Design a protein around this ligand. Sequence first.
Ligand SMILES: OC[C@H]1O[C@H](O[C@H]2[C@H](O)[C@@H](O)[C@@H](O[C@H]3[C@H](O)[C@@H](O)[C@@H](O[C@H]4[C@H](O)[C@@H](O)[C@@H](O[C@H]5[C@H](O)[C@@H](O)[C@@H](O)O[C@@H]5CO)O[C@@H]4CO)O[C@@H]3CO)O[C@@H]2CO)[C@H](O)[C@@H](O)[C@@H]1O
Ligand SMILES: OC[C@H]1O[C@H](O[C@H]2[C@H](O)[C@@H](O)[C@@H](O)O[C@@H]2CO)[C@H](O)[C@@H](O)[C@@H]1O
Ligand SMILES: OC[C@H]1O[C@H](O[C@H]2[C@H](O)[C@@H](O)[C@@H](O)O[C@@H]2CO)[C@H](O)[C@@H](O)[C@@H]1O
Lengths: 67, 1526
Amino acid sequence: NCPPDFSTQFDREKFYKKIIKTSFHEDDHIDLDIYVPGTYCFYLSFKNDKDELETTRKFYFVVLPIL
Amino acid sequence: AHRTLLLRLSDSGEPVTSCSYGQGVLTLPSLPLPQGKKLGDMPVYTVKLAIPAGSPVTRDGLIWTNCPPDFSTQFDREKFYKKIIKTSFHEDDHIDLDIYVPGTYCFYLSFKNDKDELETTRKFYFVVLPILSVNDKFIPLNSIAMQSVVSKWMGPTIKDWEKVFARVASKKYNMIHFTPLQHRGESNSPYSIYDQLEFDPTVFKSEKEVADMVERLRTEHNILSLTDIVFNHTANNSQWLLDHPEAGYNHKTSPHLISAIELDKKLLDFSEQMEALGYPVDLKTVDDLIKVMDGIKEHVIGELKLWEFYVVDVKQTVSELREKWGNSKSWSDDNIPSKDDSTNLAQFVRDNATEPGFGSLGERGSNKINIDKFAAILKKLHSEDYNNGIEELATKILNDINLPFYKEYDDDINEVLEQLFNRIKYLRIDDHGPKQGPITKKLPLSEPYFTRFKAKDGEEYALANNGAIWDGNPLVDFASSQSKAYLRREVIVWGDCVKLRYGKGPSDSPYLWERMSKYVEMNARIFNGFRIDNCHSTPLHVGQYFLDVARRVNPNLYVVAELFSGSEAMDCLFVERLGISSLIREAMQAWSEEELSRLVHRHGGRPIGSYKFVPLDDFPYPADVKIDEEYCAYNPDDHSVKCVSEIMIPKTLTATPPHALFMDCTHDNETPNQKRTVEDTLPNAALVAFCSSAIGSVYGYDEVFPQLLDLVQEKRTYSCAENTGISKVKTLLNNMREEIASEAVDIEDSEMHVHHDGQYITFHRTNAKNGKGWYLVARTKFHSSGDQMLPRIKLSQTKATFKAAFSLERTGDAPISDEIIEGIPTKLRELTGFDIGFDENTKETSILLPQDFPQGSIVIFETQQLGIDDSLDHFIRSGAIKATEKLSLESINYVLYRAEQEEYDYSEGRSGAYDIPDYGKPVYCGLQGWVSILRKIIFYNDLAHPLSNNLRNGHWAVDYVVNRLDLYKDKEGVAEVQEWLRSRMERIKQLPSYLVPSFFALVVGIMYGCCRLRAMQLMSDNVGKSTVFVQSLAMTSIQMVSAMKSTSILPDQNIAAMAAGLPHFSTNYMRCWGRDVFISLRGLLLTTGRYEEAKEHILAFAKTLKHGLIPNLLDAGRNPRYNARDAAWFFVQAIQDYVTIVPGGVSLLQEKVTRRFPLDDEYIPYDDPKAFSYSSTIEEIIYEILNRHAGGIKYREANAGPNLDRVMKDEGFNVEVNVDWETGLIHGGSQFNCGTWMDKMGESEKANSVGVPGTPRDGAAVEINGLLKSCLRFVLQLSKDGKFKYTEVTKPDGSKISLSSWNDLLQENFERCFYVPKNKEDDNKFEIDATIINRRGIYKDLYRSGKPYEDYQFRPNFTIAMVVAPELFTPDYAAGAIELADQVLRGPVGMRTLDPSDYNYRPYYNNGEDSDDFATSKGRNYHQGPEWVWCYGYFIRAYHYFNFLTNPKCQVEGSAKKLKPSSYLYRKLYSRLLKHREWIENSPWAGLAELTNKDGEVCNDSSPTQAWSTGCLLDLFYDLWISYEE
Ligand SMILES: OC[C@H]1O[C@H](O[C@H]2[C@H](O)[C@@H](O)[C@@H](O[C@H]3[C@H](O)[C@@H](O)[C@@H](O[C@H]4[C@H](O)[C@@H](O)[C@@H](O[C@H]5[C@H](O)[C@@H](O)[C@@H](O)O[C@@H]5CO)O[C@@H]4CO)O[C@@H]3CO)O[C@@H]2CO)[C@H](O)[C@@H](O)[C@@H]1O
Ligand SMILES: OC[C@H]1O[C@H](O[C@H]2[C@H](O)[C@@H](O)[C@@H](O)O[C@@H]2CO)[C@H](O)[C@@H](O)[C@@H]1O
Ligand SMILES: OC[C@H]1O[C@H](O[C@H]2[C@H](O)[C@@H](O)[C@@H](O)O[C@@H]2CO)[C@H](O)[C@@H](O)[C@@H]1O
């Protein structure tokens, strides 16, 4: 739910797509640019071994305010 | 290249028939592989499955199929593979099935039921035919010439056979059918095979010896080979039957035949000592007949123990009743009937006290009573002491139990001996084929029903021998327990053979399945195919397994079968599952000349001039589709299946009748010399060879053998006499079919006409592609019936050429040799005298036969239809895409549609629609009017339809299609579309008349599809990628948007104007209606992408502003009568939709118009400086409506009087509109004014309603106020973005009201005024007078209305506010209210305009009824019951929205946790649109009606296609697309 830029406001339930570059050798790194302090979470969706859709927990991280 | 076939599926997963070819099988056309490609380089075919979008199968749907995923994977009947159906509510899903090897394949679908359970459809089969080549030349399946030869009559050496091979090669047969070349049994019959695993030791010794001979036939004489394969029986003297006696039905495996065994050996024991008494041994007398039955009466029948097989042993049960009288001796139940009902008590014991298997045949005492359960009933019914009359009671019951068994015995015995003295008679006395040989050891009186033998396992068995019941069902195994044929002696047996007992699988007979498997694959390595005798008697699962084993060995296995099941449906099912490639048909079965003409008619082809299939208005036209620009992306070496036109919609896969192998004479039917005469051998084989199918003949038919050869006894050898009888003609017939086979392909490519006059039979074979053809006149010789003269033969638009003619004459009888089979000497005299007259004016060919044309003669003509060359199909199937290149969404309207009133506008009333004789006129003047009629004609090949008759009677309809476009020639792309029609229709008129209908429908269908494809390309993606139903709804946009001459939307020029409906709302002042245009603007123009056209209508109506309102009737720019209180608010809603949808649509507000009216409410200055005067941006036009309404409006209609509404009263013209500023609701109207969409001014003087509105909606209408709230919300956010520069609105006294406050006033007071609470407790808050009420849980239809009851009337107008202003509704109140409308107000296609439970409810509308009824007379019912279709759109749009917010079952966790509707909600939405999809499918007008009577009843006064009826359904599809399909 991290907004893509500072112009976009924060919405708790509007999540944005990010593509995981699959490889059998190389790990993939995906950046999450944060422009404003607040509460942000992330979860992952993938193709199950049953060829179904599956989702992990929501994992949160806090950016403290600047005083 | 492109070997893909399209198989469309229905909503239940069943394949759809594209044409009506009859009861058939999904067969794929046999074609050779591409140039230099083997099996595995690429898929042989690809079946594109088309599943409808939103169908009940798509719900968690999976496609199952046993098709292997690649060539490496072998084929398994029961291993199915998964395929995922991509569910969508808009787009159909296509799933390919790549097939690499011919065989039998099936598919079924699994989906989630409406009960959330799993459900499965039928298995649907389709056959891929094998590819038959000899060396490297492909042999089409319908050009097969089969010569059946019997092994034991060809000589004892291989070279003695190769002499026969050279003889049949000269006759130019390309295939040889072999009776099984295996070691034969005792009787030496070819079908009683001694050993299946080795060939005849007389000729062959190993597989390599016979495999080289078959390969020698391939390389030497260019001849393929196949054999008979016998599954049903084996020889009665096999050394493996001694080891494995369980392979057949014996007393162990099938115990029910024990009764028949003891009866069969009761005759081998009886006939051996028969003549000892032998009163009539072998005589031909009636006295002799009855004496045999009296020897049977006492010596076998009375010596078989009265047959205890059925009857319970009476006294041996009483003996075993006092015996166990002491065990279980109590029956606690009370159900036991008393001795009063002596029959119900008899069968009650049968249900409770019986050992298993009661009431069936088995051992001698098969039926028995459970003792301890019987005596327990006797003690409960009579007494616990035995001597208390139990011996009498128990015997009385058992005698009554055996009464049906005794009558089952008397009916069996009578059939045993009646069958006996009927067959023994025919063997001796009956002179229809006798042989009264004295009863010897070889021929007893009883044909042996059981082959008894001493087994090698230390036992003795009695295996029977199969046969056939006289007229019984062959699908029933007469050896199984279900039949009593072996007992009742209803079997015609073959002592040569012996049972083969297959079970449910290999588990019931292990060695039999393993032996037959190795026997099948042995011949599969050698030969090209199989032949199955009496395939209908072989069980399915047995035939399925072994034919698949053979196809794994020989992938190109060609299967023929003598299949005569119960019906054609069963024949197709056997062909479906077994993979049979051809069915045997016999020409000798025809008893007379008419039966032969009907048999030849069945397998000859399709009628001459048959219609050709084309994609029409029932197919999807994806804008993103590949196209063949000039039908040129084809190469003959690729051998690809062709698409129908330039559009690349692949060739459809439809059920076709199973292929036939027409045999002029098999090896089982009598000779033409026997059944008819010898002269008939020539015309019979000619009529068969002319059929468009596979043909065959038995050896000796061409060599005119005298009589049918006895397959059992005869040992003589075929003659080496060459070129006898028809051998010269069969060389000609087979060579001619070789020339035709090069180009004839599918079922539509070969046509036929057959005529029968007395003893003559006419056959006309025609190729539909080039026009080449053959004409056969065959005089049959069934009997010497005298001289008969055939009338003059006339061929229209055809030239004829003499090919050949022959006569067959008999020169005495046949020689009588004892070592060689010699035929009858026959003369083959060539005939002359055939006069072929050709009229160079009428282009008609006349043929006169010569008087020297005896019976048993033929004459073949080469014919050619005039005007047809090989290049005709290419010229018609090309150029149409390029011709439609410059078409626009406006110009397509003139090419496809145009009602007769619309055509009268451009032609000043001279043209109109073409009038078909004995039928009527097409619904549209364009191509759609033809396609709506032709689709059913092409599907049924109705050449007798009045349109089909008119098309071949003259070229009027042909020239009418081209001459119409002169009215619209100057329009974009119409000139080039006309020229393509002109050049193609000109080429068509040069054809024979009888071919014009088929080619007329082909040209119209091609140009129609190209125009419909061009429309989808010009529209948006949501439409250009969706189902046929969505695209069919989208084509309504083109039906309505047209430029006219008598009207428009602008007074200056005549441009495109959306009509209200066709045909009654299309010309003059009746076309454009402000309320009707802007309700359908979002659906027909915004959803489709007609943005620039949607702007023109908004600007054109923006100039016609007056009284702060949009006129109901727009006269372009002249007198627009302002009898509307609804139009301006639908107009402001369309403006919001334009800005919301059109990219950069906010610019619409700043578009400047020229107001053709003063700012005040004055008069009509059409010719004045006030026409131009001042401009007006849309921004101030919107504010002018909001402020004029709030500031109060009051006006009397201008020019009121007879000049205007000729029924409206004086007070009705005075309309005033006001806003109640305590609620914000806009009231207005009167009981004499009809300013809403329910406009119906009474006009009945017989009912006294002239000027009385049927549905006056005075006060606050939910539709008006809902759009007001939607407009306030729209302008508020618009001011937040700096787009709307107005923020205050003055009230009548003078105070200024903030727009947000007016927006909040409705938010605080709308639901309070209209909602009717379900609970009587909350009536003190929602302003309700409970005395005048109907249903609770209802949103009011009117507020402060004249009629107090019309306020609380259930009408479908509240859904309009629910769609445009959902913020005014609490979710639970709205969901429950719209659920009531679904149950009460929702019709099948239209929405009921009034609650059926109301007293004013009259749902039938007839505008012209003259009565004293205040409702039915003169159409006053318009909106008081009748079902309107557009209200259905707003209903389901809000039904989808509020069920998605309220019901938790209508939501599912979607992408990015954004909640999307569940498949449970999609299912409920899809079901409520089925009646709409049926309507537009089966309607001549390609749209949805305006109105419908009660419960789907068609209303004749209703306009058959309405703009806003379809536009409101397109609004729903846009809602689901723009919010979820991302
Ligand atoms: O100079 C042009 C025109 O000017 C004047 O027009 C007026 C009409 O004469 C006058 O009767 C009135 O027409 C209204 C009508 O009052 C109003 O109630 C409504 O009527 C319904 C019909 O009752 C209904 O049956 C249906 O009409 C269909 C019909 O069902 C169908 O089967 C088929 O026959 O086509 C008919 C339509 O052509 O629906 C209509 C509504 O669509 O609406 C009528 C049209 O507004 O008011 C007109 C305007 O003042 C002159 O009087 C007239 O002679 C001139 O030709
Ligand atoms: O539209 C032209 C018109 O042509 C034909 O009418 C012919 C025909 O012979 C008969 O209908 C006759 O009564 O009038 C005309 C004499 O040539 C079509 O039959 C007719 O349907 C068609 O409309
Ligand atoms: O006593 C209540 C009454 O309600 C229903 O009658 C309706 C009528 O059908 C409508 O036309 C309405 O406008 O007047 C009544 C208001 O309820 C029932 O049909 C009726 O039996 C019942 O008596």
